[PDB]
Amino acid sequence: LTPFLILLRKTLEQLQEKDTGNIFSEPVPLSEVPDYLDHIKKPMDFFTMKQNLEAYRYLNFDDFEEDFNLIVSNCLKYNAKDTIFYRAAVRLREQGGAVLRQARRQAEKM
Numbered sequence: 208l209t210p211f212l213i214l215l216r217k218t219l220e221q222l223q224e225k226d227t228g229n230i231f232s233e234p235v236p237l238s239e240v241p242d243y244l245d246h247i248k249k250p251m252d253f254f255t256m257k258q259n260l261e262a263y264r265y266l267n268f269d270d271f272e273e274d275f276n277l278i279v280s281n282c283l284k285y286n287a288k289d290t291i292f293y294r295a296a297v298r299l300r301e302q303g304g305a306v307l308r309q310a311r312r313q314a315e316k317m
């Protein structure tokens with residue numbers, strides 16, 4: 208459905224809008240974080256999700272939400288609590304939560 212993709216697209220932009228520092232909008236730079244992949248099984252970020260979106264890899268809402276949750280859970284897992292990343296993830300989880308709750312309600316009436 209075009210409206211499903213249209214909704215998914217709008218939702219991801221709302222999610223990106225909460226990341227005012229652009230710290231989740233591209234993959235973690237592995238040149239700067241060489242052990243990142245030692246602990247994180249599946250990295251995720253908003254551009255990768257955008258890529259999945261435009262390739263029709265999100266055919267249901269659950270997979271979209273699951274990748275969102277990875278952006279947040281990865282960041283909390285890897286980063287120590289007293290860091291800017293960890294704090295930003297705690298907040299994104301609450302703000303992202305609400306975005307995804309409203310978006311899922313829209314998908315329900317399709």
Ligand SMILES: Cc1nc(C)c(C(=O)Nc2nc(CN3C[C@H](C)C[C@H](C)C3)cs2)o1
Nearest residue numbers: 230231235236239240243281282285286292
């Ligand atoms: C969600 C998350 N988990 C982790 C481990 C990280 C993480 O270390 N991100 C990093 N990004 C950069 C690059 N970045 C730095 C900014 C200050 C400016 C901007 C233009 C480029 C270096 S380290 O982010």
